[PDB]
């Protein structure tokens, strides 16, 4: 029998605007997320919801989960978020408007999020931040001015085009620094990361535990190879990558 | 209405071994490819065939096509090949055996192909090559010793796991150097590229094309940023990337 091939054209055949993917451990938190997204406009004609299932253990981690989720997504844009975000005022139409405005402003974007660190800060004496969020540090708070280009994004809420993805590294594992890693890989691929203005409530918070310190060192050891001397800002703090001339004392 | 999410486990749910994707412009060459893969064991229980359709125009190019093809693939391994390869002796079982052997030998592999340049050659006075193929330069010919780790692969045939992909750059376009670009991105992602021993026939001759020289220069301009001084070998020739200390005269 002659094979029957499928001929593929360059066309966006999505009908859903969003695939909302979440890293899920706690059913109650995820149910709260799902109810809030539906309340704020992510109805079944607009969005589908997928969960990386970490309810029984750490099946997935921050650097691996997109590779299993992406193939299952059918939406134009793929959100990767934590289970402890919830929509509270801004909704579906606001996110679509922010993304479409970003496409007009800078078509080289590849990843967008709600909180991060401005790209190449001049002032390394303080940690640069650009965000608009409600979180444990305050309701309806801001740092910097969003939208803006960033060098890192907080992991709580990220998005990419399904047809223009970015991948996390294979040589790191765990639950820290996968937002920065994604933004650095986007730069290697020739694109950009932005923090957009899309206010939501994030009720989780950072754990500066041994894995955080381990992954901070692994990120420096990895990325100093290619970014010698750079000081990378994240909302969790600056990381002096070292390498090259910077190793002189 | 409460959203109904899909819970995703870390399981390989493929039933097809291969998705064979080809960049197609000439129907007669592609029909010959399809006949040869079926004859050599890529039957519909084992493989599906998809074509990035360039029959009417340059709809896709070498850096863009995988991003539209990958979402449509259901196989465990995705082959990205040219329309002018054909199987002539080695077949489905041989390719499976070679891939499974590579997984045992070096689980850090991310991309495999049939022809490329050994990783970090010591001898930059000649172009390093590692291949086994029949092509315009000879039937059943070899360079070097395959399988082996490479820093670049020829574009005529390469493959990745569907669940552990690598992406080509967004900031280059055209029909040269997308094999080397994929291998360099694999290294940024923490993995490796290999030339395996899987003999096929790659017919046709390269034609003079100003875009080859254009993309050689763009590749040097891009990658010298992160690989200063490196001499990158491809089967098409060495490229001294320049940059850094190497710019001293």
From Swiss-Prot, chains A, B:
<protein>
    <recommendedName>
        <fullName>ATP synthase subunits region ORF 6</fullName>
    </recommendedName>
</protein>
<dbReference type="InterPro" id="IPR029044">
    <property type="entry name" value="Nucleotide-diphossugar_trans"/>
</dbReference>
């Amino acid at each position: 029998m002659k094979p029957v091939p499928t001929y593929v054209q360059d066309k966006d055949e999505s009908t859903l605007m969003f695939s909302v993917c979440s890293l899920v451990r706690d059913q109650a938190k995820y149910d709260r997320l799902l109810e809030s997204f539906e309340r704020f406009g992510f109805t079944p004609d607009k969005a589908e919801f997928l969960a990386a299932d970490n309810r029984e253990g750490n099946q997935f981690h921050g650097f691996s989960w997109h590779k299993q989720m992406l193939p299952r997504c059918k939406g134009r844009y793929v959100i990767f978020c934590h289970e402890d975000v919830e929509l509270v005022d801004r909704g579906y139409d606001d996110l679509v408007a922010a993304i479409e405005a970003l496409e007009e402003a800078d078509p080289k974007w590849l990843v967008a999020g709600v909180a991060g660190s401005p790209w190449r800060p001049l002032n390394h004496s303080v940690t640069a931040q650009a965000l608009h969020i409600s979180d444990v540090f305050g309701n309806d708070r801001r740092r910097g001015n969003v939208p803006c280009r960033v060098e890192s994004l907080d992991e709580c809420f990220l998005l990419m085009r399904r047809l223009k993805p970015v991948l996390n590294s294979y040589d790191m594992q765990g639950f820290h620094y996968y937002g920065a890693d994604l933004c650095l890989q986007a730069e290697f691929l020739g694109g950009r990361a932005y923090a957009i203005d899309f206010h939501l409530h994030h009720y989780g918070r950072a754990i500066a535990d041994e894995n955080f310190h381990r992954l901070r060192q692994e990120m420096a050891q990895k990325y100093r190879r290619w970014f010698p001397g750079r000081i990378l800002h994240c909302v969790t703090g600056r990381v002096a990558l070292g390498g090259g001339w910077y190793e002189a004392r």
